[model samples]
Target: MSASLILDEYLKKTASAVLDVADSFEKIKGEIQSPEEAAALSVALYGAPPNDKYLSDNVLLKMSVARVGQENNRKRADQAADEIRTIMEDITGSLSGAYRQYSPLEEENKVHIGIMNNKTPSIVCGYYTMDTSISSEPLSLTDFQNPTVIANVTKRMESIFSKVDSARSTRFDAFVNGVANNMDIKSSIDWANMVENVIKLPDSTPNPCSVDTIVSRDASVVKTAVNDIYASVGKSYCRPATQLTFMSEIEKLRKAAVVCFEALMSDTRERAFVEFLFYVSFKEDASNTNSKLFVQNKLSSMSGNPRQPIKLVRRSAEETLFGLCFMFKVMPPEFMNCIFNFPTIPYGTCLTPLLRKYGSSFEKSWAHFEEILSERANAVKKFGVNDTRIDCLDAVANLTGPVYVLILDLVRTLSAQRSCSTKFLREIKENYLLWNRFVS
Candidate 1:
């Protein structure tokens, strides 16, 4: 062959080899993997908090952790961090098995929306159904224009809250009783579905003091719940039992109750809603941002791709936070007075819709929320107690929010695995409170 022909042939051959090598590298880099214990044990997804002086106290992981009581007081924080990583990974690996098993979501009554109908029959749950039956009904009553609903909601909330304050079984009963007394409410969905979620609040007894022998089946679960609540209350979340202040007897009561409940359950009702959203929400991201266990096995094993508007999730959190701070300042009924905190979120339908729309400004919203929390905390600390103030739902593409995207991610995770265990929560509680403790 001529020199020119030989050179051309050599280039083609080398290029083909290069292509093969590139293909091999691609396979290796994109190799699908599984979520294994080692992968989990290898990473610490949540870093230590500011006060986290991991080994300062030297209570290091001596035995399972460290020589039980061998050092500085700061040892508490240091040991907490290490122990946290272990537990989180342990948590991730616990439910995740040989492989994620996908089963159809088999519920008949689940609500279906038509706009997002994937037109695919892959996921069968009702919530995922896109049907023509989806029609417009008035949204749950969230407007102040309905003063009757407002009066009844506040009345019902407090009636239930009083029972909850006792940290007793009747707490849920108190909620029911309040609702019944307010039966005049034309709409339960509307009344309870206020932006602040005034009704249906669950009782919070951090450090799990007691549970209705009837409501809870497992004894240890309740006992462990108490421990988890205390761990969170002690270091993180400030001190209300500790929390913030809008500066009112009722406000103080509400804040304390709400925070305690939220920490325990985000004071959320029917944790299942968020729990259902939990598994499938972040299963396929390039990165968990939540976990560092670098294996294809995203422990989240749900089938079909379903999306929920951040609207529900965001509003759920806001309502919970806001819910924490309100009650009739007008003292108790026996005392003959009541001064209900004005739920500022409502102005009017005309104003409320515009005002309520934070519109993708989640970071600003969060920062505003943090500021509100901080203000409440500081206002109480410097002064006394008076009141507290603070403030989405949407599922758009990418769902790439920030550190605390889903208020229920941890809420759902802890609920699913530990169901309120103290171990996995330590990491989040600490980081969060570390912020509240000082930063706020």
Candidate 2:
């Protein structure tokens, strides 16, 4: 089956899973006597019965299981949503790349056009459909004439444009610094000098220095600088190549770079969203206690009279949940906000289409890189290396473009994955370790 068909089937299955869970909760909601009973029912529904031998112990376990189940549901839903978003983004990225290549001006116009077309769909036949909304109004030539409308439009456009420009500039700096602030460049000086000189040279100079200079006197200086930078800044630059060669490599690697970035962002965003949703849902249920003891006791006895042990449970769970939720949900939003609120650069808003677009691009770029690598490897093997030149020739050819592409892809991927993994692991530790410690 085609990828699209496979994705559609997966989406349908996921939607069913989510709906099934939701329906189960709805049924439990109607059957249970109180919030505690409802929570207990929900846990039992998941095939885990609560241990209520002691009222305090039973209630505490029920609350814990309920919290876990609620979180697990949110995580699963968010993950499904994340996968859907990623797939949508992949499709969007392909469309974006095609659009940019085929119609640069039209692509820009489409951005403006799309912004004017934003709408939220209402449910129809179990699927969301957008027929009429605030974003459906058509843009007219006259819309540009209105100062207020133009200003708003201009601001939005400038914001995204500035972010893209800033990210590009930062990437260039990373290329120049050779380490992207974290990695080490252990490659030969010959390549490093070529890259450094090309970047430093005026745009008019296609190749920064001659091959002799690149391998001799220029190489020493470049190596010294690279080593010094490695000592100070932590990473070295790429080897030199003509602008044409550099540009060609960029073209080849763009997809990989984009994919790594999107994967990271999507993963981070989904984790955060799930944690936040749990925090909000639970917080609303826990705020009415009168006990002066620990919050854990209060949380545990949320369904009963306020007592010392109950208050302790309430406070402990609340504190634990809050901290984990903030890291996953609050911190990420804050980071995104910082990016968006940058004084000069446009940071894509969390809910904006641009984030999705950029994310999509990154994912597609990664897939493309993998495809290119497979094709190149096959090509090299097909040639059957009878000559010594084959080794050098293959290395040179790959390094000229594919290598840079892959490196950039990796940089974006690593950066994103590191951020997400850090958050995920942090949450797990807080929920399982700290909260459990408090309970025990």
Candidate 3:
């Protein structure tokens, strides 16, 4: 393969490998240990009583309190280290020699090159001792090999296996609380079978843009954005150019920063809004949500955060379909008609394309939508935010669940919103009254 092709292939393979590691951890986690097994590990954790050798056990690993009676819910976190042994062997066995026990903790959890100037390693050794040393630095992409990068990779593989093991357990416990507590056993069992049946469906969710990828295309956009803001501000201020006269010019670096940030979020909002509309049109009837798709437009939701990551002047994500639907339905008739007047955007957004697709679906299908809204709203509302049906995971569940849920959410929102609600329709009358004045 060519150089770029080689890099691209390895990048993908690395992600797949890591995903396998994370995925296997979850699958391994699915096997909740027999109570006797957990109890046994707990005993081992505290160390067994002194044997006839007269030497009392002094060392033991700390483990979960809830899982004290089980085998870490995934075979004590060491089993997958072995499964991945086969995996990495395919990737690194050429250089990493087959002698590796690939036993316990190595590059277990957070094992990959990260964004930012992430530190990396040398011949790091995590073999049975606490000395998880390569270098003081975090991972970087200089990509070197001495005692062999494969050797370093092997160690990093199990470096924090304990963490993935722990997180997987915590996630499963939450799976029960969030997925099964309010749902009851038979349904979960029904779902387990349904999931078995659903294992063959296709994903229907739209692919979200990669933030890193998009931001890579933003430096020029940022500059152009700031320049446009400056020009717009200058036009409105009636300011003179740099000359021998006083002028209220926005020359400060801080001002440029503000305008640039404003531009970023405004741009982000447009994309996010459009992406959300896709979910609003969310559709499916596969019964269970864990098998549906396209529920959360997380890509659009996370737009600016990829670069600024929630640090700057914005809570753009705090809003969701909850507010967007209400905002569009209520923000006065004139604004909605004029909002998309500019042109069609290239990427994801919530509003414009919606009018583009569902343009008349509202007016065209009011009776249709209203019927859908009123009928399904109650049944859907019964399932709260934490309901398993609302937060599905399986292939089929994600494909069908969110769409059905969105249908209900749409109606619930319209029912409570001021522009449309009878209870809150008080605003419409008040608005009309303002227009109807006393002594015209």
Candidate 4:
């Protein structure tokens, strides 16, 4: 079962059990007299007691005062019950209010259980520890339609991406090597494909006239010579001189990156063709370890203190994604605008190829993402930077999950082909499972 489902079940049982104990407080006034007795009774009701504090002196003294008369017993019970309800409501706000609105705590999945002892007129609170590690099973495409699953996807994706980025570069490399440097059929095919696509330079034969001679000649003569060279190269003289120069390796790299990114955007996959560099980069990130380099390199320059590990992971994921977009020539803002434009641009005409690539399901998921973005934008416009009631995790999941799923699906389909490498298939399967675990 998915961890989210498991968590839902666990929380329901826990909340019911806790409330039952609290409700009994009004009825079992005779059972718990002192703070210690109150605490012991609480333990009997649940599995553990609140680690923070026991019943206090003031609470115990108040209980004693309330017992002065038979009528006062009911009054004291009512006050204690009211105070306990308020405490429960405060601690479990939104979390226990509704299963649909359940939100996880920022500090992992650790939830606090605040229990009240009406007899002692005090409260007990402690962490509710449970096994939160989700199953590593791959989910079907339809599973994403669940609102509970979708809401949790944001947190899960963040967790996966952050952990991947936080991994030590060396550790990251080792796992990446298992997939990328395996010297398998896929890698070989990729190498050959890269070589084939390299732009050929013009022959390096001696020119008719050197730059010095050309400058010394008359303007008309120089112009004539330029056209002559252009004619010999089978080119028009009207074309810019810059177009004649051989592109530098950096330019070539960008050009190739653009081609590969565009192919991914187009959702083209061939079993024998070399995978794009982005695939290699993602594989490396998936195997990342807790490390200093990536975070320090991208983030520490802005803020010297690199203390918060989880916070660092979040920053690391952001920086990594930003770097990927920049490196792949998918300008962040440009693609965002593409997503914002959505159905308005019409399916095939959109700047992003995603609109045209996947069928109805993909289109639906993409639309869902765009809807989330519009909601967030409207919220910010209305509320001006204060909390927008939109959970950050849900927003991010809506943004990243569909794309990640697209990549995973593309890889999964390719890996299933007979022409694909065994190691490549294995790597993709592992990654697919890894990604699915996060969605749950």
TM-score to true structure, per model? 0.20, 0.22, 0.19, 0.16
10 residues in a row with least lDDT, candidate 4: 119-128
lDDT of each: 0.28, 0.33, 0.28, 0.30
Superposed model 1: Cα runs more than 4 Å off:
1-80, 85-126, 130-187, 191-261, 267-440
User: Whole-model lDDT for model 3 versus the true structure?
Assistant: 0.28
Q: Report model 1's TM-score to 2 decimal places.
A: 0.20
Best prediction by TM-score:
2
Best by lDDT: 2
Models sorted by lDDT, best on top:
2, 4, 1, 3
Query: Candidate 1 vs candidate 2: which has greater TM-score?
Result: 2
Q: Candidate 4 lDDT, tens digit per residue, 1-440?
A: 89767855654564466555656656445554422222111124343432665477566533343222111123433333344223222322212324355343332221111111110101011111111243223222233233443334333334444645554423332222222223232323333222212211112322111111111112343233322322212234332111111222113322322232233332222211122222322222243444665555435324534323221011122222223222223222333333222212133234324232323333344344335434533433444324422222222222322222322232232222212233333444354444434323
Q: Which stretches of candidate 3 lie over 4 Å from their true place?
A: 1-217, 223-262, 291-328, 342-440
- Candidate 4's displacement at residue 153, Å, is 56
Better of 3 and 4 by lDDT: 4
Please write out the lDDT profile of model 2 over residues 1-440, one tens digit for every residue. 99767855654564566446555655444654423222221233443322535556545533443333222333433333344323323322212333333333222111000000011111111111122222322323232233443334333333323545654444222222221111121111112222223323343454322311111112333333323322111223333221112233334334433443443454344334333322322222243344443444434334444333211111222232223322333233433332222212222334233233323444445465556655654545554445422223333334324433433444444443444344453554354444334333
